[PDB]
């Protein structure tokens, strides 16, 4: 039967913490799923391990649709990154187990390919200008067609994507960065021409006129994405950027529900959808979301940081290969220990993935592997002005 | 003056509550409620592993910069976990903050702005004759306020093991009874009682905006939470339709959960509590924009938020110019013993303490006494086996 017989989370740390819900069957078959939350990882495990679980034994695995919205719903007190990523990690482990039951990769259970692979972007990063241009050129080299570009800020010691378990303290300046910025991108124009694709995050720090301003200066270097330019639980924040230029935009890695950018959409007030799997409420809310920005040509760009696994990197890639109005994947490798926890049959290859064609999402955990490695506490930064304001990092 | 010390409390007296207490170098402490029904062990661990490391040597009288630490820095901001953890240490601070002014809690955010504290008491029963038995018995309690509910003819289970409980669930069967049990409130009790109806999520808005219509000539002090409302736009359609008062907003963490609802005049009272609500930081934010817009503050009073939050609540409605309500569920004996407060219960009304701080404390020892146990809230479902909303 497809009767959950077992669930349970993993916990581990091979380079870094990752929280993975495994779900077996009365009939041996299991799946797994990414409840990864940065800095956040226990809030999760002790949602699956003390609430959801319980609830998971003896149901119905086939029922994915019901799991969700029993989850969802039932849970009383809705939406939420905590929240979202223990449902997500039941949802991307069902899907599994589904693919797998139905002996097809997730991609074809999915609606099946609309592409033959699928393109990422790189991070460059970089102290100075020069340093950052060096980083494209290395990666223009292994063949990435997209490279996001970051660079350290003159007269400031700390910048956001540029080079002990409580939040380390980086001191912000907006106006410094509004005047440097433009320059990084042209010296990548100047260098590397038009062809490549060019990304870059300004990382929530902006208020809104501040983001149009930056927005319209950097208009002569045709960015694929300016990337959350402000923080948007307002989800009217990002009017003012939209009506003051079109240098295309790309919000949501911090989402964790549709209807935090129901709105951002419907408006046409953003380009790209960052929000990734693990934390958007898997595969089943996902698809409403993808779905939701295609009526407005917005396209999907799946926050692919290394705090999501490589059960997320897997199931992402099956989704992204389908999915009509993809636009990129994120890509950040992630670190030889962690590969080898989580076996997989994704494949990067000059500059694109290639999704698995193993039945499931093609991820596995090694647990006996993963248990090598104990979970060490790390928490994400804060930011803070010059006058010691506390600011978003 | 610093942080010396944070921890959680964990106890069961009836029902399960999770407790932040906050201790600083000079010895003083002060607590929070982080209470989060069902999932309680979730904020425990927020608190326990990711927060309480990053309270350790703050400034304890840096309130709002703790605040702002802790939402911010989470990176992924809002939500039930993330705010109740933001809400218990708000809480703890602003206790410290009065205790070391040497002034109860209402005093520090502006003083009194009324006598006492006006509440509802839960009435509810099979029949509608039930439901009535218990109104009689309230009134006789000397509650001004009383919220309503009875069984559904023809369904098992209305609103009103340690996994969910199902219930089975019919709106239009519903639809067609409940204006029935406000007549008859009506009818026995007169008009200058106050009656409140909890639709607890089950209906569709131009389904709530039928309902509205049908129990005006009853005139609900409010119609609560009418339906899901993740999508704030779900409110208009009621609004457009009718003009019994409506509340919502229980299941709410966040203003960003509510600011249209509010600026758009789609409700009347704002229900969300300190808890859940991210503390008395967030919560006076809340309040003050709901005043802009005529809209009252009803607290969520259910057993599942601690006498910590009930405490600071009562505070806080004590000085709020735009309180609506108080609701009042009572707390089990060995909840009020584990959970030392004076706050005073008289005549229908709530009265704040006067020692400084919110006014309650936490007996350690008691409280170890009662282990947690695992309860789960209910799911919902519909007569074909659809999975709703309760
Ligand atoms: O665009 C990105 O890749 C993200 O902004 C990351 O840099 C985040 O900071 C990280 O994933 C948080 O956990
Ligand atoms: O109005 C109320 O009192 C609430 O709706 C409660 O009945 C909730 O169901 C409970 O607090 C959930 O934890
Ligand atoms: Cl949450
Ligand atoms: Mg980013
Ligand atoms: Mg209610
Ligand atoms: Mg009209």
Same mark, same amino acid.
């Given at each position: 039967?497809?009767?959950?017989?077992?669930?349970?989370? #993993?916990?581990?740390?091979?380079?870094?913490?990752?929280?993975?819900?495994?779900?077996?069957?009365?009939?041996?078959?299991? @799946?797994?799923?990414?409840?990864?939350?940065?800095?956040?990882?226990?809030?999760?495990?002790?949602?699956?391990?003390?609430?959801?679980?319980?609830?998971?034994?003896?149901?119905?695995?086939?029922? #994915?649709?019901?799991?969700?919205?029993?989850?969802?719903?039932?849970?009383?007190?809705?939406?939420?990154?905590?929240?979202?990523?223990?449902?997500?990690?039941?949802?991307?482990?069902?899907?599994?187990?589904?693919?797998?039951?139905?002996?097809?990769?997730?991609?074809?259970?999915?609606?099946?390919?609309?592409?033959?692979?699928?393109?990422?972007?790189?991070?460059?990063?970089?102290? =100075?200008?020069?340093?950052?241009? @060096?980083?494209?050129?290395?990666?223009?080299?292994?063949?990435?067609?997209?490279?996001?570009?970051?660079?350290?800020?003159?007269? #400031?010691?700390?910048?956001?994507?540029?080079?002990?378990?409580?939040?380390? +303290?980086?001191?912000?300046?907006?106006?410094?960065?509004?005047?440097?910025?433009?320059?990084?991108?042209?010296?990548?124009? +100047?260098? *590397?021409?038009?062809?490549?694709?060019?990304?870059?995050?300004?990382?929530?720090?902006?208020?809104?006129?501040?983001?149009?301003?930056?927005?319209?200066?950097? +208009?002569?270097?045709?960015?694929?994405?300016?990337?959350?330019?402000?923080?948007?639980?307002?989800?009217?924040?990002?009017?003012?950027?939209?009506?003051?230029?079109?240098?295309?935009?790309? /919000?949501? +890695?911090?989402?964790?529900? /549709?209807?935090?950018?129901?709105?951002?959409?419907?408006?046409?007030?953003?380009?790209? /959808?960052?929000?990734?799997? =693990?934390?958007?409420?898997?595969?089943?809310?996902?698809?409403?979301?993808?779905?939701?920005?295609?009526?407005?040509?917005?396209?999907? @760009? *799946?926050?692919?940081?290394?705090?999501?696994?490589?059960?997320?990197?897997?199931?992402? /890639?099956? *989704?992204?290969?389908?999915?009509?109005?993809?636009?990129?994947?994120?890509?950040?490798?992630?670190?030889?220990?962690?590969?080898?926890? *989580?076996?997989?049959?994704?494949?990067?290859?000059?500059?694109?993935?290639?999704?698995?064609?193993?039945?499931?999402?093609?991820?596995?955990?090694?647990?006996?592997?993963?248990?090598?490695?104990?979970?060490?506490?790390?928490?994400?930064?804060?930011?803070?002005?010059?006058?010691?304001?506390?600011?978003?990092?």
């Amino acid at each position: 039967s497809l009767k959950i017989r077992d669930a349970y989370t #993993i916990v581990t740390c091979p380079g870094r913490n990752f929280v993975t819900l495994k779900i077996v069957t009365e009939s041996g078959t299991h @799946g797994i799923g990414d409840a990864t939350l940065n800095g956040r990882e226990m809030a999760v495990a002790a949602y699956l391990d003390e609430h959801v679980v319980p609830a998971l034994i003896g149901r119905d695995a086939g029922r #994915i649709e019901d799991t969700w919205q029993y989850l969802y719903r039932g849970a009383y007190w809705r939406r939420g990154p905590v929240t979202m990523t223990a449902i997500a990690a039941v949802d991307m482990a069902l899907w599994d187990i589904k693919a797998k039951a139905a002996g097809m990769p997730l991609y074809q259970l999915l609606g099946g390919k609309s592409r033959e692979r699928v393109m990422t972007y790189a991070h460059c990063t970089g102290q =100075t200008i020069e340093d950052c241009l @060096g980083e494209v050129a290395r990666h223009v080299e292994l063949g990435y067609r997209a490279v996001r570009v970051q660079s350290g800020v003159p007269g #400031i010691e700390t910048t956001y994507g540029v080079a002990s378990s409580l939040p380390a +303290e980086h001191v912000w300046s907006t106006e410094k960065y509004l005047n440097h910025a433009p320059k990084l991108f042209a010296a990548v124009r +100047e260098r *590397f021409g038009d062809d490549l694709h060019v990304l870059h995050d300004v990382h929530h720090r902006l208020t809104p006129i501040e983001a149009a301003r930056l927005g319209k200066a950097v +208009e002569p270097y045709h960015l694929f994405w300016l990337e959350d330019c402000v923080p948007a639980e307002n989800q009217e924040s990002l009017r003012l950027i939209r009506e003051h230029t079109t240098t295309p935009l790309a /919000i949501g +890695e911090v989402f964790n529900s /549709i209807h935090d950018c129901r709105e951002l959409i419907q408006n046409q007030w953003i380009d790209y /959808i960052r929000m990734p799997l =693990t934390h958007g409420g898997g595969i089943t809310a996902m698809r409403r979301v993808a779905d939701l920005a295609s009526l407005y040509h917005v396209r999907t @760009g *799946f926050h692919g940081a290394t705090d999501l696994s490589p059960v997320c990197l897997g199931a992402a /890639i099956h *989704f992204d290969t389908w999915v009509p109005n993809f636009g990129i994947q994120e890509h950040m490798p992630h670190t030889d220990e962690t590969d080898a926890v *989580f076996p997989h049959d994704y494949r990067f290859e000059d500059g694109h993935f290639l999704a698995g064609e193993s039945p499931g999402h093609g991820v596995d955990i090694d647990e006996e592997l993963a248990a090598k490695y104990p979970y060490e506490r790390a928490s994400l930064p804060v930011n803070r002005l010059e006058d010691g304001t506390l600011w978003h990092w």
